[PDB]
Design an enzyme around this catalytic site. Structure first.
Site, PDB file in Angstrom:
ATOM      1  N   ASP A 351       0.894  -1.164   0.000  1.00  0.00           N
ATOM      2  CA  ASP A 351       0.000   0.000   0.000  1.00  0.00           C
ATOM      3  C   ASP A 351       0.925   1.204   0.000  1.00  0.00           C
ATOM      4  O   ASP A 351       2.030   1.128   0.538  1.00  0.00           O
ATOM      5  CB  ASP A 351      -0.870   0.026   1.259  1.00  0.00           C
ATOM      6  CG  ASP A 351      -1.969  -1.016   1.229  1.00  0.00           C
ATOM      7  OD1 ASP A 351      -2.922  -0.862   0.429  1.00  0.00           O
ATOM      8  OD2 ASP A 351      -1.871  -1.989   2.007  1.00  0.00           O
ATOM      9  N   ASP A 703      -4.438  -3.584   6.806  1.00  0.00           N
ATOM     10  CA  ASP A 703      -4.609  -3.169   8.203  1.00  0.00           C
ATOM     11  C   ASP A 703      -6.014  -3.279   8.804  1.00  0.00           C
ATOM     12  O   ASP A 703      -6.159  -3.271  10.031  1.00  0.00           O
ATOM     13  CB  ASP A 703      -4.113  -1.738   8.385  1.00  0.00           C
ATOM     14  CG  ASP A 703      -4.896  -0.748   7.563  1.00  0.00           C
ATOM     15  OD1 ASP A 703      -5.070  -0.987   6.349  1.00  0.00           O
ATOM     16  OD2 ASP A 703      -5.333   0.277   8.127  1.00  0.00           O
ATOM     17  N   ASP A 707      -9.050  -6.312   4.914  1.00  0.00           N
ATOM     18  CA  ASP A 707      -7.823  -6.767   4.245  1.00  0.00           C
ATOM     19  C   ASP A 707      -7.465  -8.174   4.739  1.00  0.00           C
ATOM     20  O   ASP A 707      -6.659  -8.872   4.130  1.00  0.00           O
ATOM     21  CB  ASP A 707      -6.638  -5.829   4.532  1.00  0.00           C
ATOM     22  CG  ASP A 707      -6.797  -4.454   3.899  1.00  0.00           C
ATOM     23  OD1 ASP A 707      -7.126  -4.382   2.693  1.00  0.00           O
ATOM     24  OD2 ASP A 707      -6.578  -3.446   4.615  1.00  0.00           O
TER      25      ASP A 707
HETATM   26 MG    MG Z   1      -6.180  -1.168   4.379  1.00  0.00          MG
END
Ligand code: MG
Ligand code: TG1
Ligand code: ACP
Ligand code: MG
Ligand code: NA
Length: 994
Positions: A351, A703, A707
């Site tokens: 990310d 997180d 996910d």
């Molecule tokens: Mg996330």
């Protein structure tokens, strides 16, 4: 009712046949409860201590071992003599390992959380509903809520189910949906239907999600779904269906098991086929029973020598140590078996925000219109200094410091940044640094107005806690914020309705300050502002604004651009419905463009380098970002993922573009892409799947619970330190610092740890091979047992355990990261190395049998009976071969065994040195290359003598001290092993490399 968000409020009530005022009737409750079950995820499958212990005996090797504990047991019983002090030792030692093995195995299961069971932290015990059997609200257990009944939630509450909001009692309703949509800022909920039936959770602005929290307000709603049908429930089911495979090592070790078990049986058959000569013997005579015990006895030895009993503990020890070492680098590994797989990482999907970048927003450029005169047009571009949130910095034009106030466009530009904002600064008396209060993006704006100070408001006299929101205050005191129209992804902008402060009963002066993604905002501008004046937006000028924006966001600046604007003549306060977000875009029409601000979310100062190590290591890096495609590529080129000028047409996709491609072309895309922007909820998971179809060991970050599925699926799920506990428990590793580079660093450590494990693994299995040669030789020949169980076990748990553990500390190679990722299908032993250990084994098989048979032939202190054919007999049921002399128990002499055991032990300390390197002679790489090895070999010997002189032991081990003469014969038979290896290593270097 899965689609409740797209149905009208009346439609849901109609659907479930329930009235908003009364609620469900006891008949409905009952009937609904049976149709939908209780509102709760299913319980974990209870694994009992018994079952947890029985599994410990599922592995082929712990089974063979058990079997030997039986044969050994039985024999220890039906045995001759009266020495029970050492008789039942053999079986009890085996059993103890099988016990410690269980104890440890069971111990790990007691303390080991699982992602799924962690989701239940998000389901509350109680909830509040309205049912037809009572006027007042009644709080019950969340478990008893059902689709269809009317529920009530207020600030502080944790949503008990997926709810369609019916009516908001408070003024507004804010919800903390972090765990589900990643939105850390609380979001506003409405009650109007969301038209798209296929809308993702973020855009379901009329829904409350089970497990979420009411940040503020009070609302009444109808339960749409419960249990495993909720958003968090569907996540729970995806995880339960996800099956993580066994690591490459675990698989290799498993195949080794089957084979070792398959060889152990073939060696038995053989030892049988070599003793067929007994079928040609007379039925009468010979102690058969004292022959059956011989077979079984060596069978036990066969097994004990074949199974590398100490391997599992060495591996574990080494893995704990590396793990503690990785923690030092902020890489928190949760699964020891993951350190290996981590080194195999083929792809890393990361990310951007907070990981590749710092997420420390800072505005560093802004422009207003200078003047418009027909085709002619000029803008006023500016620059700002200071990358922190601290109000320390300055505006500059053409690099020369100016004062914002001297420009009107900037006064207004600054007004908008202050009023159309929900963020503020705060000075930490402690850290002595200015922190941000709210979204990083808006705070950068707050920080900008302080630096600009359009009104020259003397603030140097003011303290540091006051300097914080000074200039903002000045601007707030000017206009009255009547209310704000929240930001939303459909229109991608937000605005605030404002009325002048010092003004009596007036119906003129009201203004709207709009902020948002440039394309959308600029399109709704029919006017452009020039200082204080205003003129019609013309095709040309609209291009000027747009081209600069394209330069700032698409170019090397990689700036997040925001268009700022005002609606000079906004609608009348009474003519606006501040309840249907769907009408907010119209309210923000017929605008006047004021200017643009471009902020920077800077890449970590270590990522560029880490990205380069990955290219060196042959590791692909895929970026996943919320930025649009253009800016995402720009950022990718900036940090090195893409080359500054390479073509990326089919190497970067948006979520939309990805969905349009047919399954076949999506898979293809995933092998080529390094950039995914505007990606959907199901995408990370799909990308992992596609990556695995090409057999790539994938590392994926995340997180939130949303996910979790992806993290569970990726070979290496990586969670942020600052992320949810669910994301963490669903991951193989946690980044304590959230930093991308921490991943790469962990990968290299993962490569170094395995290279060493490969050494001590081959080291240990290498001996087990030799031991099994000695047992087979000392059997197919029919000689006195050279080595016995209780001895072998000490050599594989202690004697060879220390050198092995030390081996785990061999210095790592220099080009560790200049080599591609290791193939998982890569075997630890094969080809020439196999042959090397083939020979070494044959050598250790002889060096032991020999040193044992030596003391029975050409040895002084022992029967100097050369060629006496120990083979001829071990029955002594005749005594004829030996005329004069009554003595047949020196066959059990402990002196020779000590010769075999000292040979083994000595050779293994030697072979431990042949292990510092697979192919480098001890000439280039000396034993002192690993001081821990030396010190470890010193300890293994001090332990060998320990069992030779400390009375209690020598008896238990069936051993006796050796003569300085004999100890030499031990060396004259061990030390050569090194020359043997050197020749083999040498042969592999200059005669098989290329
Ligand atoms: Mg996330
Ligand atoms: C542990 C002790 C012994 C003696 C054993 O049976 O090891 C075999 C065996 C099971 C394998 C072999 C041993 O094979 C032989 O010695 C060939 C048959 C002749 C035996 C004659 C005995 C008098 C390993 C040990 O040794 C050598 C020196 O050739 C190497 C390797 O092992 C590895 O790569 C380690 C895996 C963790 C494996 O071929 C492996 O089988 C596999 O599936 C592998 C891929 O695993
Ligand atoms: N508070 C705000 N007010 C006005 N516009 C905003 C805004 N926050 C973001 N934007 C604009 O909306 C566009 C982005 O939509 P969104 O805010 O959901 O994406 P993002 O870039 O923040 C990633 P994420 O959605 O994961 O947090 C931005 O590129 C920006 O131009
Ligand atoms: Mg955002
Ligand atoms: Na995983």
């Amino acid at each position: 009712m899965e689609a409740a968000h797209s149905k009208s409020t009346e439609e849901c009530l109609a659907y479930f046949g329930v009235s908003e005022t009364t609620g469900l009737t006891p008949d409905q409750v009952k009937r609904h409860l049976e149709k939908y079950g209780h509102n709760e995820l299913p319980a974990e499958e209870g694994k009992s201590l018994w079952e947890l212990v029985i599994e410990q005996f599922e592995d082929l090797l712990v089974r063979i071992l058990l079997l030997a504990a039986c044969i050994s047991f039985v024999l220890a019983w039906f045995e001759e003599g009266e020495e029970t002090i050492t008789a039942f030792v053999e079986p009890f030692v085996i059993l103890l390992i099988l016990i410690a093995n269980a104890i440890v195995g069971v111990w790990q299961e007691r303390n080991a959380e699982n992602a799924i069971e962690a989701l239940k932290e998000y389901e509350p015990e109680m909830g509040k509903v309205y049912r037809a059997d009572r006027k007042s609200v009644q709080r019950i257990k969340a478990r008893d809520i059902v689709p269809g009944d009317i529920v009530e939630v207020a600030v502080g509450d944790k949503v008990p189910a997926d709810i369609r909001i019916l009516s908001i009692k408070s003024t507004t309703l804010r919800v903390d949906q972090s765990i589900l949509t990643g939105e850390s800022v609380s979001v506003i909920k409405h009650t109007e239907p969301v038209p798209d039936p296929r809308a993702v959770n973020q855009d379901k602005k009329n829904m409350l999600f089970s497990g979420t929290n009411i940040a503020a307000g009070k609302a009444l709603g109808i339960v749409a779904t419960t249990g495993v049908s909720t958003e968090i429930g569907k996540i729970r089911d995806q995880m339960a269906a996800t099956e993580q495979d066994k690591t490459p090592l675990q698989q290799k070790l498993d195949e080794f098991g089957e084979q070792l078990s398959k060889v152990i049986s073939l060696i038995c058959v053989a030892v049988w086929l070599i003793n067929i000569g007994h079928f040609n013997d007379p039925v009468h005579g010979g102690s058969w029973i004292r022959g059956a015990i011989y077979y079984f006895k060596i069978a036990v030895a066969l097994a004990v020598a074949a199974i590398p009993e100490g391997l599992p503990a060495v591996i574990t020890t080494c893995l704990a140590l590396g793990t503690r070492r990785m923690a030092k680098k902020n890489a928190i590994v949760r699964s020891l078996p993951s350190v290996e797989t981590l080194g195999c990482t083929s792809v890393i999907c990361s990310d951007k925000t907070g990981t590749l970048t710092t997420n420390q927003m800072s505005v560093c450029k802004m422009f207003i219109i200078d003047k418009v005169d027909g085709d002619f047009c000029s803008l006023n571009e500016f620059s700002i200094t200071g990358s922190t949130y601290a109000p320390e910095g300055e505006v500059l034009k053409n690099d020369k410091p100016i004062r914002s106030g001297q420009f009107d466009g900037l006064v207004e530009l600054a007004t908008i940044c202050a009023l159309c904002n929900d963020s503020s600064l705060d000075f930490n008396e402690t850290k002595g640094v200015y922190e941000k209060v709210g979204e990083a993006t808006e705070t950068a704006l707050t920080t900008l107005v302080e630096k600009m100070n359009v009104f020259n408001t003397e603030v140097r006299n003011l303290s540091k806690v006051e300097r914080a929101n000074a200039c903002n205050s000045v601007i707030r005191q000017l206009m009255k914020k009547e209310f704000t129209l929240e930001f939303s992804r459909d229109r991608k902008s937000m605005s605030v309705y404002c009325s002048p402060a010092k003004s009596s009963r007036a119906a003129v002066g009201n203004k709207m300050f709009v902020k948002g993604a440039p394309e959308g905002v600029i399109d709704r501008c029919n006017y452009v502002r020039v200082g204080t004046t205003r003129v019609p937006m013309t095709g040309p000028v609209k291009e000027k604004i747009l081209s600069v924006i394209k330069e700032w966001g698409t170019g090397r600046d990689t700036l997040r651009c925001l268009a700022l604007a005002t609606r000079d003549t906004p609608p009348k306060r009474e003519e606006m419905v501040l309840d249907d977000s769907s009408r907010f875009m119209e309210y923000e029409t017929d605008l006047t463009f004021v200017g643009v601000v471009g902020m920077l979310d800077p890449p970590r100062k270590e990522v560029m380098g880490s990205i380069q190590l990955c290219r060196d290591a042959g590791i692909r890096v895929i970026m996943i970002t919320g930025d649009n495609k253009g800016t995402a590529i720009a950022i990718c080129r900036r940090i090195g993922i893409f080359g500054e000028n390479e073509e990326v047409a089919d190497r970067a996709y948006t979520g939309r573009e990805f969905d349009d491609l047919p399954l076949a072309e999506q898979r293809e895309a995933c092998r080529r892409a390094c950039c995914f922007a505007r990606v959907e909820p199901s995408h990370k998971s799909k990308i992992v799947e596609y990556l695995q179809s090409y057999d790539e060991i994938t590392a994926m970050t995340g997180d939130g619970v949303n996910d979790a599925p992806a993290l569970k699926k990726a070979e290496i799920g990586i969670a942020m330190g600052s992320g949810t506990a669910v994301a963490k428990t669903a991951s193989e590793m946690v980044l304590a610092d959230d930093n991308f580079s921490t991943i790469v660093a962990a990968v290299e450590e993962g490569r170094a740890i395995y290279n060493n494990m490969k050494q001590f693994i081959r080291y240990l299995i290498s001996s087990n091979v030799g031991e099994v040669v000695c047992i087979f030789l000392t059997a197919a020949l029919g000689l006195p047992e050279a080595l016995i169980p209780v001895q072998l076990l000490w050599v594989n748990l202690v004697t060879d355990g220390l050198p092995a553990t030390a081996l785990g500390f061999n210095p790592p190679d220099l080009d560790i990261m200049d080599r591609p990722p290791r193939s998982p299908k890569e075997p630890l032993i094969s080809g020439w190395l196999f042959f090397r250990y083939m020979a070494i084994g044959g050598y250790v098989g002889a060096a032991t049998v020999g040193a044992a048979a030596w003391w029975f032939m050409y040895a002084e202190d022992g029967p100097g009976v050369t060629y006496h054919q120990l083979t001829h007999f071990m029955q002594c049921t005749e005594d004829h071969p030996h005329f004069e002399g009554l003595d047949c128990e020196i066959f059990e002499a402990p002196e020779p065994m000590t010769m075999a055991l000292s040979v083994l032990v000595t050779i293994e300390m030697c072979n431990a040195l042949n292990s510092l390197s697979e192919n480098q002679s001890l000439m280039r790489m000396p034993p002192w290359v690993n001081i821990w090895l030396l010190g470890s070999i010193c300890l293994s010997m001090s332990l060998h003598f320990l069992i030779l002189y400390v009375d209690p032991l020598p008896m238990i081990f069936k051993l006796k001290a050796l003569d300085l003469t004999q100890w030499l014969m031990v060396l004259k038979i061990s030390l050569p092993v090194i020359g043997l290896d050197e020749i083999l290593k040498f042969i592999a270097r200059n005669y098989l490399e290329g």
